[PDB]
Amino acid sequence: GMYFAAGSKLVIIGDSITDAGRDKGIGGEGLFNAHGSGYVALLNAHLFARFPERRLRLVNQGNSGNTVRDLAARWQNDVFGLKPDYVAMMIGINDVWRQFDLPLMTDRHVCPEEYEKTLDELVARTAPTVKGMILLTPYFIEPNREDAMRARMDVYGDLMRRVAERHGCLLVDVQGAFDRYLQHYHPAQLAWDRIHPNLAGHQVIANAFLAATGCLNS
Numbered sequence: 275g276m277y278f279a280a281g282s283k284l285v286i287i288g289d290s291i292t293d294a295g296r297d298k299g300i301g302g303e304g305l306f307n308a309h310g311s312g313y314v315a316l317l318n319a320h321l322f323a324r325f326p327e328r329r330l331r332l333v334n335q336g337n338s339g340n341t342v343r344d345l346a347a348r349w350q351n352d353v354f355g356l357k358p359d360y361v362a363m364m365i366g367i368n369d370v371w372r373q374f375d376l377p378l379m380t381d382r383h384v385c386p387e388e389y390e391k392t393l394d395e396l397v398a399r400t401a402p403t404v405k406g407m408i409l410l411t412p413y414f415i416e417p418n419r420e421d422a423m424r425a426r427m428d429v430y431g432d433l434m435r436r437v438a439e440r441h442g443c444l445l446v447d448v449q450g451a452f453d454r455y456l457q458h459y460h461p462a463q464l465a466w467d468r469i470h471p472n473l474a475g476h477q478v479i480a481n482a483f484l485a486a487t488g489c490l491n492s
C-alpha cells in the first residue's frame with residue numbers, strides 16, 4: 275500500500291457491509307473470523323498476499339444496521355480508543371435505506387442535514403489525530419439513476435464528497451465502481467437486495483479502495 279506507511283494500523287468502521295458477519299467478541303483484530311467475509315477481509319487478504327513486507331494491521335469495526343448517528347455514539351471507544359494511524363469510514367446506506375423500507379417512522383430517519391453535520395464532525399475530530407482518513411461513499415446497486423432510492427443515495431454520496439474535500443480526506447468512489455460493473459451484469463448477479471452482495475460484489479468494493487490507495491496491482 276503506497277498510500278499507507280509501513281507497519282500502520284488501519285481501522286475500518288461502518289455498517290453490515292463493513293461488519294460482514296465478523297465475531298464482535300474479538301474486537302476487530304484476531305485469529306478466527308475477526309474481519310468477516312466481506313471487503314474488509316478481502317482487503318486484509320490482498321494486502322498480506324501482495325505486500326507482506328508492508329505489514330499493515332487492519333481492524334474491522336463494522337456494526338450492522340448502523341447509521342452515522344450510531345457511529346458517533348461509539349466513536350470514542352471504537353475509533354479513538356484504538357489509536358489508529360488511518361481510519362476508513364463507510365456509512366450512509368442505512369441512513370438512506372430506512373427512509374424507503376420504513377417510510378412512516380420519521381423519527382428514525384437521518385436527514386441530509388444531520389448526515390452532513392455528523393459526518394463532518396466525526397472527520398473534523400479524527401483528521402488531525404491520524405496520518406490519513408479514507409471516506410468510502412455509500413452505494414445502491416441500481417443503475418437506474420432516477421430511482422427514488424438511487425437518486426437519494428447519490429445525494430448522500432455527494433455530501434460525503436464535499437466533506438472529504440473540506441478536510442482533505444481520500445474519497446473512494448464505491449458507487450462508481452459498481453456502476454462500471456453494472457455495465458456487464460444485472461444487479462441480481464451481485465445482490466438480490468441491491469445492498470448485500472456476494473463475494474464478487476465485495477471484491478468490487480475492495481478493488482475501489484485499493485485503487486484509490488494505489489495498491490490494486492503488484
Ligand SMILES: [Cl-]
Nearest residue numbers: 289290338339
Ligand atoms: Cl446494514
